[PDB]
């Protein structure tokens, strides 16, 4: 009858975050899955740390969690060839020609809200290649559910074995111990970070780079690197929107966990009340952990793209400096 975390009644494809921490690398996270696996991970430690006599069960729990991690990562690796095929296409869209020869002032008018015909051809491939990856993840859904259910069944079995000296006044040492050893470190790590300042700095990058794009678009327009910038800028906007979503959660859950933990330690509860509060803390930690994990990787992706974006603008420094209504080689 207890409120246990269930598998989403949502349409999977809408809850996937794509990460690109460095060049030549792409990965994905099915958000509900990560939250679900993390939820039951906390439920498992809370169940074995309740009684001072079951602390020794941690190695078995650690082994099982590591197994689930391997098994889950094995299913997601079934989409590797197809994911690698997407990476090759992104490589083409982001690097249409080499911009590394500083002793080369070459204007690529020869190639051919996008305009460039050759970029538009590479873009349609990207749309198909991306759509295929989502279909591959959607096609392996049941295999992902099977693993999620095995983690659910394990956590729930441990939780059913939780027992008190007197059901009228159950102890909360498990909640205290687990927090202190598994959660508290993460809370302090978040609290040492200025997440809102990170958002301000990203907002400025996006708005300032948009002005540089507006300038280039007016002078060049049809140039392949203009579409490349339009492509990187749009990706950076989605990335930022995701960081903003996760930051809101991180900030909320930091306050809630700190407040809720104070209401739960160094006191007793009737068994029923104890179990409901373990399920509720597990929910707060899973949501907080999922978002800090994603935020960190999305932050890395944003700056990986920004570094390239900055290199393209530096490559087009001559046109950026050029006078209003003055234009470089016009193309057709
Ligand atoms: C599960 O996730 C990753 C898999 O690479 C790993 O770094 C992490 O330590 C694993 N968690 C546990 C508790 O084994």
Bound compounds: 2-acetamido-2-deoxy-beta-D-glucopyranose
The backbone outline, from C-alpha atoms, is elongated
Which band does the percent of strand residues land in?
under 5%
Give the helices and strands as they follow along the chain: EEHHHHHHHHHH
Radius of gyration: 25 Å
Q: Estimate the helix proportion, in percent.
A: 55-70%
DSSP summary, beta strand count? 2
Number of domains: 1
The strand line-up of the biggest sheet is 1-2
Largest sheet entry: 2 strands, antiparallel
Q: Specify the structural class.
A: mainly alpha
Q: Count of DSSP helices?
A: 10
Distance between the termini: 69 Å
PDB class: cell invasion
Keywords: malaria, erythrocyte, basigin, PfRh5, cell invasion
Assembly: monomeric
Entry title: Crystal structure of PfRh5, an essential P. falciparum ligand for invasion of human erythrocytes
Would you kindly provide a brief summary of this structure?
The chain is built from 10 helices and 2 strands.
Describe the structure.
The protein is mostly helical and 332 residues long. The chain has one domain (1-332). It contains 10 helices and 2 strands; from the N terminus they run ββαααααααααα. It has a two-stranded antiparallel sheet. The protein is elongated and about 85 Å long. Bound molecules: 2-acetamido-2-deoxy-beta-D-glucopyranose. The site of 2-acetamido-2-deoxy-beta-D-glucopyranose has 3 residues, from α2.
